[PDB]
Amino acid sequence: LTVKSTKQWTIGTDVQGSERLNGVSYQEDALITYGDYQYVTFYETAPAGYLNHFVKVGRRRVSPSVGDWEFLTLDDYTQKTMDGHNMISMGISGDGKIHLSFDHHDVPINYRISKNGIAKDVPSKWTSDLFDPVVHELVGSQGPYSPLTYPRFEPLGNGDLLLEFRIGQSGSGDSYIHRYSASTGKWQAYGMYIQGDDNNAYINGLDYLDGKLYTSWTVRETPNADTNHGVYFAYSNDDGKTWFNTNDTKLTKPISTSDDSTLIWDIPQNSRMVNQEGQLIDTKGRFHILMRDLLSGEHQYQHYLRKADGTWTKNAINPAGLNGPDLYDPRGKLAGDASGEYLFGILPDPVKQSTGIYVATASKDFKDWKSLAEIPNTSTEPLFDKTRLHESGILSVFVRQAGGFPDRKLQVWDFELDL
Ligand SMILES: *[C@@H]1O[C@H](CO)[C@@H](O[C@@H]2O[C@H](CO)[C@@H](O[C@@H]3O[C@H](CO)[C@@H](O)[C@H](O[C@H]4O[C@H](CO)[C@@H](O)[C@H](O)[C@@H]4O)[C@@H]3O)[C@H](O)[C@H]2NC(C)=O)[C@H](O)[C@H]1NC(C)=O
Ligand SMILES: C[C@@H]1O[C@@H](O)[C@H](O)[C@H](O)[C@H]1O
């Protein structure tokens, strides 16, 4: 496997402040291909300047030829909170509507939707008036909508879309799922699906494939990030309503963080393992988790693999040149190609201030990690486009540069793979 071509685009100037608002690990998602177009969302500085931002949404054509990015500015909602939690997630439903949820740290939901199915019936003109106002509920569904952190979208197989988030706080919180029907345009509540017990679960993402929804998490006791413990897993065969552990044992609804039956790896507190890193269902149905810890004696990225024979394995990702991250360093992701043979570790390096793209193969039990490419000059939690990789064999990555405002840009890097 080799890179046929490498291209980059600067899509905006990052915002100024002591927190990272763009390129955050739990954006789900920031960069999405739907039909023939790719979409991206990020904050840019509003005319009021420092500590005033607007959400932007970019689009470009990617099939059958790649066209130029164009952007709209949502200049009716000013993001003002310098808190690295307050990121943006986007989702696109099978009616073509684009959904955005953003700007939360233990506050009520902030959500909006396109008026029409602009990703299906693609308008000529790309402007802000394609979006409805910001609302603080999900029409058709019910609360609680506060205190909300971590909106995550997952597109389902019938065009529907899940929206998942935590209600409560670090060290004491629960998570919920809501489902948007593409056929009716109404949301419905799936309710609480994981319940804390004077702690909170921190999921790594949502992964849906062929009618099954997968997630993994750690449990956090207190607002101190050293108090994470365990690596957990569950899946659902009904889009979030009911859940099973790794042994196909049905769980209680909601899943309790006290139920050890979802534990797949014992990781104590003070292991230097961070919440909300990376997960992946590959296209052959093997589940993968990216975490980190110091348990070997050195800080290293860790790959957890749920094998087909049922067994979990854990292997350090330690290819030559990769500096291992500590608790607070940027978080990575895992991506997969259409075949399921290739696993990509998209791993920010805290020494180099760059993002390494490493590849392992299913034939080698993913032990063969190798440096494939690098995105230089990043201070970001890199985020990729799942669909674009599956459909075209292009690994497309959204990144915040390193460096100082206003030199520090937002970019999309495309690695055309020789698949
Ligand atoms: C429900 O699922 C859980 C989670 O997967 C599962 O618990 C796991 O069971 C495995 C298999 O027993 C445990 O793995 C072993 O851990 C012990 C530590 O006491 C070691 O002895 C084992 O190492 C030997 O066996 C390995 C087999 O591959 C060899 O590679 C190794 O070199 C040794 O010979 C092995 O690692 C694992 O600890 C648990 N995990 C947890 C989190 O509890 C449980 O069994 C499932 N229950 C049912 C009813 O299916
Ligand atoms: C460790 C800490 O954990 C949560 O508060 C969020 O994931 C935040 O982004 C991360 O920095």
Ligand code: NA
């Ligand atoms: Na607690």
